[model samples]
Target: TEYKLVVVGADGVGKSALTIQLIQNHFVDEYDPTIEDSYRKQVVIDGETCLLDILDTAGQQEYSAMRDQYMRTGEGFLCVFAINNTKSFEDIHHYREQIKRVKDSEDVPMVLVGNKCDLPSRTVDTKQAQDLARSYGIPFIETSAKTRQGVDDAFYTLVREIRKHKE
Candidate 1:
């Protein structure tokens, strides 16, 4: 069976970074504007023989309709934000609303991921991110695409939650 999960948030918050970290474990320097479309990948986890179609959603307002369409297929969501950008953290609530509009379940199993946590010198406080996540009803953690910290944990948590629901 396949689990459809969507990585979403505003632009430049490392949605692609998280995707790369999970699927390839390599961080790169090039980024192309999403242009109203998303990238997808298939993978298996923990011997489940599952296909994870990781869709990288565009962050532009003009592409919101396109974003909504991709989101509608998502059985779960990973709201990615940059720990260095307070704006990204702030925008997450709105993004969650967008997710809820489509996912429409409090128990739909979403997670709050603050990427770029390695940049703590220029990052938002972890407490703030956790508080915001608590308000949104999900587990929260900070991750670094460079250090690969919390990256595996986030994916593990998602798969665990998905399995729990299935069982």
Candidate 2:
């Protein structure tokens, strides 16, 4: 009934933006004043009540221990990258390794998020991201926080993956 999902990514990957989209729980039309930091959501997935608690940050702590402690408590991860930035995509592997290291498990519940599709420019390719997801044995999803498209599905998908890991 309870799930803790964390969003991790490089500085320009729109990680915070995606979290806001999830909190809104729909395509954002009105500006929201009631958001930031962690969030909680209520819904049913796979016909069971789900309580979702999210941990995503504006600025990750400047210290490594703080980041480690933060990642240790998450049940699932949404490792995001900007489709318009090759650098952000490159860092995805680092986040995965850190999650596995903190959780002490090679296989963790996670999904790869390719953000910023609303823009016309592209630096990362969809097939390349999917290839990486396949290599990591996780699902790959594309999203645009600006348009709020695919936002809910990304978080919902992570919950589904988390459920898969539990049993």
Candidate 3:
């Protein structure tokens, strides 16, 4: 089966950072956040052999309407936010609603990703993030894509769940 994976968040929330880190296995010290869109290698689950067609979307405010268009074609979502960006975390509701509006009623699987774990000082309230996950009936993860922390586990967690659901 084919899986469409999307990385979404508000601007400057490390969506691109997570994408590049996972696809390229490298990290940049900084980014301009001007690019609207891009694509790279897809992430395949190691044990299950499941492939994900990853989409790195623009977080710009002007692209919000177009963002909804991409959500329609996705099979699953990786809603990422910066650990240090409260606004991005708050944007989770918007992402959820957009997915609902575009996708069918059953709602595909969602994995909440909080990136930038490397900077403890910039971290958002963990409980708040947890609450958001619980409210949505989804799992939450904190990762440092720069260091590749929780990177594999995050994707694996979703993959295993998807496979289990299949079984």
Tell me each candidate's TM-score. Answer: 0.84, 0.86, 0.82
Q: Evaluate model 2: give its TM-score.
A: 0.86
Better of 1 and 2 by lDDT: 2
**Candidate 1 lDDT tens digits, 43-160:** 5567666667667776666647656656776767888889788888888888888777776777777889988877845557878888887887688977887888988788767767
Deviation from native of the Cα of residue 90 in model 1, angstroms: 0.6
Residues 1-167, candidate 2, lDDT per residue (tens digit)?
A: 79988888877677767776777644444433222357788878778898888877544435555345557778899999999999989989988887888899988999999999998899898899999999999999999988887887898899989888889
lDDT of 2 at 159: 91
> What are the runs in model 3 whose C-alpha is more than 4 Å off?
36-46, 59-70, 164-167
- Model 2 residue runs over 4 Å out of place are 25-36, 62-70
Cα RMSD for predicted model 2: 3.6
**Highest-lDDT candidate:** 2
Error of 3 at 128 (Å): 1.9
Candidate 1 or 3, higher TM-score? 1
Q: Please say which candidate is ahead in TM-score: 1 or 2.
A: 2
